[PDB]
Design a protein around this ligand. Structure first.
Ligand code: SF4
Ligand code: SF4
Ligand code: FES
Ligand code: FES
Ligand SMILES: [Fe+2]
Ligand SMILES: [Fe+2]
Lengths: 633, 633
């Protein structure tokens, strides 16, 4: 089972699933092999009913699509559509939150409110919305209206791009025509230009993709901003992760999907319903997290993380998961059929994301508490049905310190330099105690033994004194292997990095260091890493493409991960991807994405499936940035 | 060559292309056979980097996608993305026109103006924009602002849906949640819900597709509305079609693509540059049309149509095409490589639609005349280079009467009943002189011998007294085979239909009948057919799903054609498609689209590749509607 997942709790459940004849994502992968090479390489097009068209990577015909579309056009159009789909997932997420904030301050959704006034006012100031002499509710209405306005064309560009990057970076992007005009505007323009008989020049197509990736960045940053207003900016928390956070004697409820509008209410209502659960014979309601909505409630409330991404079905295989409460994105639809065998009640809540065979409970912001109680009562009913049944919860968990929003990191650093909090970090970059910064982001992928690339690469970078931050299921991978437990600093970290983590931790009243990896939150919270790096750039007076900062989507899967990798390149970062995107069928497209884009944005993709090699390439990229700043390395 | 195209001019150029070793779309199709059956059936998914996933239509594994996505989910998600892509092509087209009208009335683009005041005021009234006491420029600014506002969420739904269909139809659609909230909003929501781990219920997915198809309808109707304001509502015109409209001694300039913002200016400037062309040794500039932008200038100015859709490369093979002026959509990118062999200058004009190897001339509305002159001078240069070269223009053309906007049809009918113009048409439906109405729409497709389905089906329907209207390349197919020449009424039409066409034609001062088929314009002008049918519904006090009206996308190709077929079903029409869409790998999806959707919208798809059978099925659908109105048939 170690060839499927490096997580020992997942291995234990894979053995149980095999014993019980329950098909898993890994079994479905094996049944798909060998996968289509035209699709793997990007050399397939279905954009009109004359298709499907394919192109042989090498040899004889077919060499070109029926309409004359070349390999480079086909590959670029496919990639662009993936970027647009990822941007669309962040459009829905951020829009959901914008509408919730508007309803909250218009008196239409009393379960929601402004929890972080300071964040509200700082966002308003960043957008140019006046705050002096204004009620918070009116400031928030203006912020919500601004968020919604960034979805369409108007007299300004997308402000959740132009107000969040350094002016020098905005100027570079504007000179190449890459600033988005509107989030949904760019998504639609991609779908248009990639349709049959439209854009058919690889460079032109890929420039469009870069622009649409910035629409994805805007949606991410908007999502984080609005969630912090509504639910609070994260500060340091301690919790646990992995399947052992489930409790045989509790009603175990997983929140799974993405948006805190749902999960945050589940958390608060679950606390109100403790006695109702105890009347059913449980100890209480044990809310646990899967995927990004799990990360959201982990960061804000210390809700323990059950599992992530590719291994999500394993939480059900324990037999102890009473409900899985879903909103949208990254939910394997297999969960609805596995529920029949495992006893779990799978509940969908959003009109645009239903799964055949699941129970649907509409969740309206206006009736959030009422709807949450309905959902949780189904969970209590399900717990009652498993009275007396044996369960198999692996006794496996790790300690997780998290909650490192950018505000939290700045505050922690401020204990070393109150009026110039970024300077202690920069001081240690300059003196070599911190070699550089690496963001781990994105998914697991069934093609890669689960977590193997994240942990192999992180280990090498930490030994070389790289400050490692993580989001999404990259944070999930690292937390489940102990990388968020400060007890592992001595084993994992180079001496310079250990000295920095220790100095910061002791100045914040811990008697111990910060953890080896800083968890910066969910996938939308990749925007927090952008905020940190942009702040560093501004303090140094340079653009992001001069900073010793890199990113790694080491086990990427979702279209959202493709979009995020692309905006990482667009804002100026060397960006590793550890699975093959469908570009290898075009050398010209591959050369643009891995090389000549450096001349446009200063960033570039590093496609490398071997994680030891990827770590070396990421270190080389960091050290080249160090050299360009005249620093030793 | 008759197995490739039924057009004899195309056959002649296919022989020339073969002689000269020039590869065509048909050669590229042959080189693609056998095409992938997973793609043909819809049983392929590339929506994440764990793919590609496929499902065997029958037999053993694979049976399910890696994430658990079933065949019905995979098929529905693919179809939804196609609908969204078609909607996006109409979003770009309509948006282009909205921005042009706004610039025109803000004094920023003096080459554009309000040409149709009556249309402007009627649209304003339909939208609820006040006109009394307002300057035309302010009314137009309001209309342009309303058009742009329908792209995003606001306090009203998409008004280019809700104000153009009968209230009873709006009520049916609203009850099922199918009214779009915003054009680009729906496109993005499709891309979100179809991304990995989101919507995974076939009915839910397909309802989303129906809603997005209405966003496409809105874009079409907006495009027609705005183009009529700016360039004039069509009235009856006479011209010619097919390759013989090219002239060896003229500078032959094809306008190709979609938007009249470009082609309409080409037409007017070309007239201004006659002497400059005569100084180059030509007789003048001969502007000819390809595809929809050709239809636009045919309908408004009688510009002759050269060719359409699948046969577009053949215009170049004559050797006499000096320039091909492109904007976007349905342009085979092969044209840029064929240009090298044929001498043609291929010119792109839009930033989002470039073709490697073509010359790009930006075309800004603000500098339209200047840019048109630059483009046309390249065409004159190219004509000079072919002095003395032999050309082979097939001496083949047809006569085409066209320009039947809905306003033109109503005006023509008004000569028989001034205050109740639709009544003479309804009278003849009731008495059986007109059996029903069929709209032919959409593309040619290399899989179908060019025009064979359109002409075979049209012949059978006309003999059975069906009033036939046509748009796009369906109009192109019918015009190139004589169906728009009133001289063919006696041969083609049943006695009842002939009597009606004759009565209307003679009352409009022609001494002869209307043509056998009424050309209602470009693909966006499918919206004109909607306007006519909605007006008939309103005059009869019934919904469109009770009218004896059907549609046929007999040789469909583009994602736009899939979107149009879907909104035809959604508004209540039996809708034939003559090529296989990628749905046959899911029986549940096929059953929804061809049967159970009848219970939601009253429309349904008729998938039928044999055109004689398709004609019988369309007649059965018409006659069933007749029976439901208590009429003989
Ligand atoms: S767009 Fe071109 S390449 Fe793609 S399916 Fe259609 S004919 Fe083939
Ligand atoms: S979304 Fe599901 S079915 Fe599609 S490629 Fe990814 S794993 Fe396969
Ligand atoms: S041929 Fe396999 S992905 Fe299309
Ligand atoms: S397997 Fe051929 S279209 Fe994907
Ligand atoms: Fe996520
Ligand atoms: Fe068209």
């Amino acid at each position: 089972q170690n060839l499927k997942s490096t997580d020992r709790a997942v291995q234990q459940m894979l053995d149980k699933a095999k014993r019980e004849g329950i098909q898993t994502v890994w079994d479905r992968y094996e049944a798909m092999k060998p996968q289509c090479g035209f699709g793997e390489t990007g050399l397939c097009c279905r954009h009109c009913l004359q298709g499907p068209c394919r192109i042989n990577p090498f040899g004889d015909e077919p060499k070109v699509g029926i309409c004359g579309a070349t390999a480079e056009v086909i590959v670029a159009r496919g990639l662009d559509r993936s970027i647009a789909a990822g941007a669309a997932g962040h459009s829905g997420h951020a829009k959901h939150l914008a509408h919730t904030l508007k309803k909250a301050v218009q008196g239409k959704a009393a379960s929601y409110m402004i929890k972080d006034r300071t964040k509200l006012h700082s966002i308003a100031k960043r957008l140019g919305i006046p705050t002096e002499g204004q009620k918070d509710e009116d400031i928030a209405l203006e912020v919500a209206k601004a968020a919604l306005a960034d979805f369409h064309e108007k007299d300004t560009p997308v402000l959740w791009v132009t107000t969040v990057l350094p002016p020098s970076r905005v100027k570079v992007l504007s000179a190449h025509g890459l600033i988005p005009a509107g989030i949904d505007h760019e998504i639609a323009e991609i779908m248009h230009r990639t349709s049959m008989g439209c854009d058919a020049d690889a460079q032109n197509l890929l420039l469009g993709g870069l622009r649409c990736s910035l629409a994805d960045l805007a949606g991410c940053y908007m999502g984080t901003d609005l969630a912090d207003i509504l639910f609070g900016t994260p500060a340091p928390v301690v919790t646990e992760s992995n399947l052992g956070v489930l409790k045989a004697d509790a009603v175990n409820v997983a929140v799974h999907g993405h948006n805190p509008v749902l999960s945050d209410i589940i958390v608060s209502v679950s606390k109100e319903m403790e006695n109702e659960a105890r009347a059913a014979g449980a100890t209480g309601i044990n809310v646990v997290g899967i995927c990004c909505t799990g990360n959201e409630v982990l960061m804000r409330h210390g809700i323990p993380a059950c599992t992530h991404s590719v291994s999500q079905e394993m939480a059900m295989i324990t037999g102890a998961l009473d409900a899985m409460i879903l909103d949208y994105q990254c939910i394997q639809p297999s969960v609805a059929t596995i529920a029949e065998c495992t006893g779990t009640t799978v509940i969908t809540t959003m009109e645009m994301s239903k799964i055949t065979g699941a129970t649907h409970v509409n969740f309206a912001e206006e009736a959030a508490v009422e709807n949450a109680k309905q959902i949780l009562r189904l969970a209590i009913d399900t717990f009652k049905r498993r009275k007396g049944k044996p369960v198999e919860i692996p006794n496996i968990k790790t300690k997780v310190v998290a909650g490192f929003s950018t505000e939290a990191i700045i505050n922690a650093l401020s204990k070393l330099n109150a009026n110039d909090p970024l300077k202690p970090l920069i001081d240690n970059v300059v003196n070599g105690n911190i070699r550089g910064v690496c963001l781990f982001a994105g998914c697991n992928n069934v093609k890669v033994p689960q977590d193997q690339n994240f942990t192999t690469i992180a280990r090498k970078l930490l030994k070389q004194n790289v400050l490692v931050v993580a989001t999404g299921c990259g944070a999930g991978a690292l937390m489940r292997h102990g990388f968020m437990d400060p007890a592992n600093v001595d084993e994992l970290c180079g001496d310079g990095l250990k000295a920095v983590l220790t100095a910061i931790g002791e100045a914040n009243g811990l008697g111990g260091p910060l953890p080896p990896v800083l968890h910066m939150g969910s996938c939308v919270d990749n925007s927090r890493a952008v905020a940190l790096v942009a702040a560093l750039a501004n303090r140094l007076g340079v653009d992001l493409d001069r900073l010793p900062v890199v990113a790694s989507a080491a086990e990427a899967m979702h279209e959202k991960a493709v979009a995020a990798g692309t905006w990482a390149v667009t804002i100026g970062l060397p960006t590793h991807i550890g699975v093959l995107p469908p570009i290898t069928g075009s050398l010209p497209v591959t050369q643009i994405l891995t090389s000549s884009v450096k001349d446009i944005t200063g960033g570039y993709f590093i496609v490398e499936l071997d994680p030891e090699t990827a770590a070396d390439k990421l270190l080389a990229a960091i050290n080249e940035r160090r050299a360009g700043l005249g620093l030793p390395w």
